[PDB]
Each structure stands twice: as structure tokens, then as C-alpha cells.
Ligand binder design. Structure first.
Ligand SMILES: [Cl-]
Length: 226
């Protein structure tokens, strides 16, 4: 199918984010590639404005699910690729337990041969000495599932999942994710039966990079049906 055939090989990815968390403004630029055949993402992100004011792990979810590997028998449930190349809008509200929330809006679409994720992020109600603004979270990311359901009213999908960031003292910082995706184009898209995406991500540092940055290797596979 249309959307599907755009992901059979390696595709270059660009990510651009502008954010404002409790008035702390910043920008992040990411570059890399995705290979949906193996549900693989390899990306390096840079805070182009200086020091990132929130921990990098808290931006992982915000920073292209069209690269998830959907098993052959689940192909009709792949909303993400079906919306390409025109793309989709991805919106979220992320509630950090006992702290603030991020609200994000992004447009994911192809620009030529490149898959682009343009994002705006707004964070409010954070505690200036909490786990986020106080940088008390470990530089890692636990594996977890992403639950997807059809949202027929919006010709898109509704997604929810819980993320637990690791606090340096051994505790955990819950980040409840509520997500919606709707197509940008007016073409038909695939509305899925309930299923989930199994996601794992390894975070590292470029030993030769002096700017504040994050190197990420991520694998995502759809599951939950037959
Ligand atoms: Cl831990």
C-alpha cells in the first residue's frame, strides 16, 4: 500500500523541537535514521540553545511511530504508515506525578525522502526543585508498552501508557501519557483494533560531543493481536 511502501528501507529522520517549561525556553535538533523492517531508530539529539532545562529521558517520548515494526498479520492496524506521506498530527498531555505536565503538538510527515517530526512543547506547574527541573532522574529509559485504540470520531487513534523515570535515590517518577493522532491529509487511513507497541530504548553519550545531547537506539514492535 501507499504509506507502507515508503518504509521498506532505511529512511533519514529529522526532528526539531521548540519548548518552554515553566518559562525555561530551549530547542532540540535531532538527526538519524529509521528502518521499520526491524522497528529500529538510531538518533542523536542536540540542545541547540545551551543546557537542556529538563532531563533528556523526559523528552524521549516526545522526540515517529511510523517506524514501528508491524508484523505482517497486523498490517491493517498500522495507522502511522497509512497516513503517509501527508502525515499526521500527534498531540499529548504528559502528567508527571506530583509535579507539572507537558503538552505537546507535533506534525510528522515526509519532506522529500526525509521523515520529519516538528514539535512544540509546553510545560507548566513544575516544581523548580522537583525531579524534573531539579535534574534528579537517571539517564536511562525502561522498556514499556504503548496502548493504541481507534478514535473513529477524529479519523485517528487514541493512545495511552505509563512511563516510570528512574529517580536517582532509587524511587520512580511516574509520567502518565495521553496521546492522540489524526491525519493531516484527507486520504483514507487504517483505524486499528486494540493493540500495543512494545518499546525499548538505550540512551548513551557521544564521547566527542561537548554540547548537551542524547544518542538513542530504539526498537518498537506491534503486538497484541493473534
Ligand atoms: Cl532504580
Amino acid at each position: 500500500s501507499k504509506g507502507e511502501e515508503l518504509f521498506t528501507g532505511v529512511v533519514p529522520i529529522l526532528v526539531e523541537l521548540d519548548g518552554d517549561v515553566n518559562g525555561h525556553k530551549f530547542s532540540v535538533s535531532g538527526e538519524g535514521e529509521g528502518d521499520a523492517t526491524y522497528g529500529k531508530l538510531t538518533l542523536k539529539f542536540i540542545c541547540t540553545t545551551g543546557k537542556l532545562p529538563v532531563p533528556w529521558p523526559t523528552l524521549v517520548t516526545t522526540l515517529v511511530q511510523c517506524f514501528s515494526r508491524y508484523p505482517d498479520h497486523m498490517k491493517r492496524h498500522d495507522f502511522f504508515k497509512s497516513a503517509m506521506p501527508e502525515g499526521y498530527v500527534q498531540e499529548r498531555t504528559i502528567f508527571f506525578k506530583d509535579d507539572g505536565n507537558y503538552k505537546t503538538r507535533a506534525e510528522v510527515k515526509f519532506e522529500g525522502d526525509t521523515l520529519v517530526n516538528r514539535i512544540e512543547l509546553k510545560g507548566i506547574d513544575f516544581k523548580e526543585d522537583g525531579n524534573i527541573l531539579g535534574h534528579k532522574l537517571e539517564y536511562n529509559y525502561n522498556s514499556h508498552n504503548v496502548y493504541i485504540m481507534a478514535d473513529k470520531q477524529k479519523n485517528g487513534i487514541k493512545v495511552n501508557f505509563k512511563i516510570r523515570h528512574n529517580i536517582e535515590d532509587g524511587s520512580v517518577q511516574l509520567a502518565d501519557h495521553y496521546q492522540q493522532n489524526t491525519p493531516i491529509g484527507d486520504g483514507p487511513v487504517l483505524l486499528p483494533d486494540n493493540h500495543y507497541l512494545s518499546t525499548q530504548s538505550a540512551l548513551s553519550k557521544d564521547p566527542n560531543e561537548k554540547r548537551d545531547h542524547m544518542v538513542l537506539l530504539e526498537f518498537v514492535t506491534a503486538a497484541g493481536i493473534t
